[PDB]
């Protein structure tokens, strides 16, 4: 069966990838974000949703998970969804300034603020994508993210979390945290994923060189044909 | 029906993408190379090939098409193929030095030279990927590419060309050029694709913002579900 990583194991795999294999940051981020988008479309495809086009709020954090979120949003657009992004804290680097402009001229909107009540979120959006915190998260959940997460736990619409349900401890989880319905584990799942009890768990990030998989004994399952995601069960 | 571009139209679409939309070079190159790999796997999937794992020679040029080739090779590896790269002329930039190392630690080999007879190519490789020249090609086909193309036209195994059959005039074609069996048109097809008479023509590069498609009246067909390629016929 497939292996679930420690924060330490995953920080290590990630640094091989950029330092040894010399994969570039935005290369992998593109592929990670595509997988997210691809998991969401397979779990909640347009035909099955009530709105044509189905609506989605993508909430992006201040670090790389936020980045994956921006990329996901843009592929969601192309896959037939009507996404909206809340990106309250934006790092000033070209990486992120470029992902912002791309989404803008796709006509994907950026909310100036978070709807403060879960019911309004539920009414506006058929799905919320949690791209706030990922693998390297150590916090200390500070504002404005505490109250975002507090709105999220009152939602009736599904939450799709990228890599790690934000607010959960990367290894241990959080019983009183948000309880997503879809989780996209990128590269390899993290021990906190054994606490996941939603209906959909996909593996994404089809870019792990087989010698890395053999080295860290990841026992990655075989993605089918040309797919960039695989449903874990 | 879908539109076929002039060199001038495509140089323009490409420069919007990087200058206006601020898509990054390696972002799109990743997605282009993934589509190539995905077209090849759907046209010539492992189960249908005689070797397990099916073998492939990817021939990379000195410019961006070569880049797409390197990316294709690496996804081909993950998709279940045993690729080999001939990259005789290598630009010294991180972009390309990184794509080279990635392939190396995937255990994808780089030929020191081209097999000089088509029969040897046919015996070693079940498929040849032509990533030599693409859209911005103006040449003046110089060495060592003249003799590569001259080996290629004597092949019995299929050739898969990325974007433009190398040696063909980007608009007009070339009746006495190489005659690929698969063509992957990236972003949008080029007028030379109306001269293509092989069995497989896929469109790839699922990243065109709809307002660009509407502006340059590309009439892009609808890629199905989450696929990054579409078969044209
Ligand atoms: C292990 N690992 C991850 O868990 C992850 N999540 C997002 N990018 C990631 N990368 C690049 C990674 O190597
Ligand atoms: C139009 N066009 C192309 O035809 C192409 N081929 C490879 N990259 C490409 N890009 C980025 C592009 O914009």
Swiss-Prot record, chains A, B:
Residues 10-220 form the YjeF N-terminal domain. Undergoes physiological phosphorylation during sperm capacitation, downstream to PKA activation. One of its GO terms (cellular component) is extracellular space. Its main location: mitochondrion. Its cofactor is K(+). It catalyses: (6R)-NADHX = (6S)-NADHX; (6R)-NADPHX = (6S)-NADPHX. Keywords: Isomerase, Lipid transport, Metal-binding, Mitochondrion, NAD, NADP, Nucleotide-binding, Phosphoprotein, Potassium, Secreted, Transit peptide, Transport. GO terms for molecular function: identical protein binding; metal ion binding; NAD(P)HX epimerase activity; nucleotide binding. Detected in testis and sperm (at protein level). Expressed at high levels in heart, liver, kidney, and testis. Belongs to the NnrE/AIBP family. Catalyzes the epimerization of the S- and R-forms of NAD(P)HX, a damaged form of NAD(P)H that is a result of enzymatic or heat-dependent hydration. This is a prerequisite for the S-specific NAD(P)H-hydrate dehydratase to allow the repair of both epimers of NAD(P)HX. Accelerates cholesterol efflux from endothelial cells to high-density lipoprotein (HDL) and thereby regulates angiogenesis. This is NAD(P)H-hydrate epimerase.
